[PDB]
C-alpha cells in the first residue's frame, strides 16, 4: 500500500509528463496520492495558464456573497447573504480596503491562528461559482476548460449516453472567505488552479476516514443533522483543526499558492480559506475509479443543496433507487 499515512503529496511533472492529464492522475494514484484526499501539482517551469492577468477587471461578479458566521470560533455555520453585483476591479479594491485586507502577520501559521480565532467576528464577501475560464485558448496542457467531460467518462465506462455539459467556475476571494467542509457533488474529483493573488489554505480528511468526520459533524451540528442526512452538502459547516484534533479526526493541511494546481479525490472531505485577494478556477472531473464512489454518494433531498442540471443524469443512472426521492427533494 502506497502512502499509508495518507499524507498530502506534492508532484512536479516535467513538460513531457504534463501532456496527458488522465495518465498523470493515474500515475499520482499509483503513488497513493488519493489516500490523502488532496494532492498538489506544481506545473512545469515552462508552462503558463495565460499571458497576463492585466485585463480581468471587467469580469462581473453578478452575485457576491457575504459570508455571515454563527456559532463559536472553532465550530460554526456560515450563511451566504446576496449582495449587489460588482466588477472584479471593484471587488479587488474592496478586498484591499482597510475593512477587508489581510492583517499584519508573521507567517502562514500566524495567519491560520488569526483566521480561526477571528473568522466568526467578520463577514467577508466571496465572488464564488462564476461560470467561466481564465485559461488562454491556446494553453494546451491542464486547461481546465478543455478537459474531458464527466458525461463522456460515464458514457465510456457504462455505455450510456446522457445529457449535460460541465464547465469551469471562477472564484474571487479575499481574506477570511471560506469554503466549508464538503465532498464534491456525486463524490467527484475536483481540480483547482490558483490563477493569481494571495494563497488558499486547505484542510482535508482521507477518504477512508470520511465517515469519522461525518459522525463528528452530526454531533457538532445536531439541528442541521436532524434536518438533512447529508447536510454537509449544504456547504455551511466549519470545524477548526483544533476541534478535529480534540476529537481524533485524521486530517492534513496545506497551502496552495498562485500558479499551483490542487486536485481533490473522490470522497475527500475538504475545507479552507483565502489569505487575501485572489482568483481560482475549478471544475469537477471523473476517472474510471470514480464510478464506484458515484454509486455510493450521499444525496441531499431536503431541498437546501444546489443541484446542477448535470447531476440529474448522474443520480438517474448511478442511483436509480434514490432518483425519485432526490428529484422531489428539489
Ligand atoms: O465551495 C466553494 C465555494 C462555496 C460555494 C457555495 C456554497 C454555499 C452557497 C453558495 C456558494 N469553494 C470551494 C470548494 N472546494 C474547493 C475549493 C473551493 C474554493 O473556494 O476555492
Ligand atoms: Fe470542493
Ligand atoms: Zn439537505
CB 273, CB 176: distance < 8 Å? yes
Give Cα 183 distance to the centre of its chain.
Answer: 8
- Structure-determination technique: X-ray
SS3 10: strand
Interstrand relation of 237-239 and 261-264 (parallel, antiparallel or unpaired): unpaired
In the CATH scheme, what is the code of domain 1-330?
Answer: 2.60.120.650
> In the chain, what are the domain boundaries?
1-330
Q: Say which ligand is closest to the CA of 284.
A: 2
- Mutation choice for ligand 1 from 40, 128, 224, CB with most ligand atoms inside 8 A: 128
Interstrand relation of 169-173 and 125-131 (parallel, antiparallel or unpaired): antiparallel
Sheet of strand 125-131, all strands in order from the earlier edge strand to the far edge: 9-11, 38-41, 261-264, 189-197, 278-285, 169-173, 125-131, 65-72, 75-82, 237-239
Determine whether the annotation assigns residue 300 to a binding site.
Answer: yes
Distance 289 CA to ligand 3 centre (A): 26
Q: Say which ligand is closest to the CA of 185.
A: 2
State the Cα–Cα distance between residues 139 and 136, nearest whole angstrom.
5
- Mutation choice for ligand 1 from 66, 176, 235, 272, CB with most ligand atoms inside 8 A: 235
CB 102, CB 176: distance < 8 Å? no
State the Cα–Cα distance between residues 173 and 100, nearest whole angstrom.
11
Please report the resolution in angstroms.
2.0
Q: List Cα–Cα distances, 329 to 161, 219, 284, 304, in angstroms.
A: 25, 24, 23, 9
Amino acid at each position: 500500500a502506497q502512502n499509508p499515512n495518507c499524507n498530502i503529496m506534492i508532484f512536479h511533472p516535467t513538460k513531457e509528463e504534463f501532456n496527458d492529464f488522465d495518465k498523470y492522475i493515474a500515475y499520482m494514484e499509483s503513488q497513493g496520492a488519493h489516500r490523502a484526499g488532496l494532492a498538489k501539482i506544481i506545473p512545469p517551469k515552462e508552462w503558463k495558464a495565460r499571458e497576463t492577468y492585466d485585463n480581468i477587471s471587467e469580469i462581473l461578479i453578478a452575485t457576491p456573497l457575504q459570508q455571515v458566521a454563527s456559532g463559536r470560533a472553532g465550530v460554526f455555520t456560515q450563511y451566504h447573504k446576496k449582495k449587489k453585483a460588482m466588477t472584479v476591479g471593484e471587488y479587488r479594491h474592496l478586498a484591499n480596503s482597510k475593512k477587508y485586507q489581510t492583517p499584519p502577520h508573521q507567517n502562514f501559521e500566524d495567519l491560520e491562528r488569526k483566521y480561526w480565532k477571528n473568522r466568526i467576528y467578520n463577514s467577508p464577501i466571496y465572488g464564488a461559482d462564476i461560470s467561466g475560464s481564465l485559461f488562454d485558448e491556446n494553453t494546451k496542457q491542464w486547461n481546465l476548460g478543455h478537459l474531458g467531460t464527466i458525461q463522456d467518462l460515464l458514457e465510456k465506462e457504462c455505455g450510456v449516453v446522457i445529457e449535460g455539459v460541465n464547465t469551469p467556475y471562477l472564484y474571487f476571494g479575499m481574506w477570511k472567505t471560506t469554503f466549508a467542509w464538503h465532498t464534491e457533488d456525486m463524490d467527484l474529483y475536483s481540480i483547482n488552479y490558483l490563477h493569481l493573488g494571495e494563497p488558499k489554505t486547505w484542510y482535508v480528511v482521507p477518504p477512508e476516514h470520511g465517515q469519522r468526520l461525518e459522525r463528528l459533524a452530526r454531533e457538532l451540528f445536531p439541528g442541521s443533522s436532524r434536518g438533512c442526512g447529508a447536510f454537509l452538502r449544504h456547504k455551511v459547516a466549519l470545524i477548526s483543526p483544533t476541534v478535529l484534533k480534540e476529537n481524533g479526526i485524521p486530517f492534513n493541511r496545506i497551502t496552495q499558492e498562485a500558479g499551483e494546481f490542487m486536485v481533490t479525490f473522490p470522497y475527500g472531505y475538504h475545507a479552507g480559506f483565502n489569505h487575501g485577494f485572489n482568483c481560482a478556477e475549478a471544475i469537477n472531473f471523473a476517472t474510471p475509479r470514480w464510478i464506484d464512489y458515484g454509486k455510493m454518494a450521499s444525496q441531499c433531498s431536503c431541498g437546501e443543496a444546489r443541484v446542477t442540471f448535470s447531476m440529474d443524469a448522474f443520480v438517474r443512472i448511478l442511483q436509480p433507487e434514490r432518483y425519485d426521492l432526490w428529484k422531489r427533494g428539489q
